[PDB]
């Protein structure tokens, strides 16, 4: 149905808002000027707008001569964001099952893969905008709802991007499931070396200063300042640096730039654990 894709309301507050424009056509031949802004207003997403009107279309007979003065409404709004409204409207049932599987708000989530589909941002600032958004608990599902999005945004009537941006976003979609599939390993590394587990470090941070590594492998060492302040006070050097090490070489190669950026990367954390082991075996 196109009623149950409307992720503005509760199940009966979408019922009476769309009764209070069914009766307002239902005058049979009314003012249809300014009762677009009183739909505007009910709904104010586009998405929510078009399925409403898709709803009155439902409905007979009021009907062989103003289904076409409604049918050119649906046609205004969508001319000028039919991407937006697309994405909104094939992934509104993911938007359900996720909303509620993670318990949260729907149109959020809708909004985040609407947002994606539509996004020039690196697809490491992607993944830490889904993490600030979402939350870390969060930061694994939020990927299978924008794939399970995705899988049905192209296998619906109505896709929202042809073939070539569908084949651009999946790409954008493969590196994100590898920067996760870094995440998922060093936070294995995490627990055996136990860092966070004395309650100084935050594992969201310790993630962070990961995912900048990958973005500017140059300034690793500045990088990882934020962390060592916090480090000493518990652990050690060659800790901290053999754990970020360690989870490099088996991880994803593409997650970098390239592969002599990746370089700059294992080169500086090998220069690192080594110049921390001398200077501790020293003493």
Not at 33 to 41: V, Y
Request: with cysteine; glycine share 4%.
């Amino acid at each position: 149905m196109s009623q149950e894709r409307i992720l503005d309301g509760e199940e009966d507050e979408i019922n009476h808002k769309i009764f209070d424009l069914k009766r307002t056509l239902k005058d049979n031949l009314p003012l249809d000027r300014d009762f677009i802004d009183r739909l505007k207003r009910y709904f104010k997403d586009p998405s929510d707008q078009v399925l409403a009107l898709r709803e009155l279309l439902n409905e007979k007979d009021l009907t062989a001569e103003q289904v076409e003065l409604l049918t050119k409404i649906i046609n205004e709004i969508i001319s000028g964001s039919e991407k937006s409204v697309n994405a909104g409207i094939n992934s509104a049932i993911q938007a359900k099952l996720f909303g509620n599987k993670m318990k949260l708000e729907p149109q959020l989530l809708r909004a985040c893969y609407r947002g994606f589909i539509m996004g020039n941002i690196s697809t490491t600032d992607q993944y830490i905008e889904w993490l600030g958004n979402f939350g870390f608990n969060h930061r694994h599902t939020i990927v299978n709802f924008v794939e399970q999005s995705l899988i049905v945004d192209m296998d619906s009537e109505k896709p929202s991007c042809n073939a070539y941006e569908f084949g651009f976003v999946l790409s954008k979609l493969i590196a994100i499931k590898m920067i996760r599939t870094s995440d998922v390993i060093f936070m294995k590394k995490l627990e055996s070396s136990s860092l966070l587990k004395d309650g100084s470090l935050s594992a969201e941070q310790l993630l962070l200063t990961l995912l900048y590594i990958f973005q500017y492998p140059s300034e690793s060492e500045q990088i990882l300042t934020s962390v060592i302040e916090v480090s000493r006070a518990s652990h050690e050097d060659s800790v901290v640096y053999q754990t970020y090490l360690s989870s490099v070489n088996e991880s994803p190669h593409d997650i970098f730039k390239s592969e002599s950026e990746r370089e700059i990367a294992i080169n500086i954390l090998r220069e690192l654990v080594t110049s921390a082991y001398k200077k501790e075996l020293s003493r």
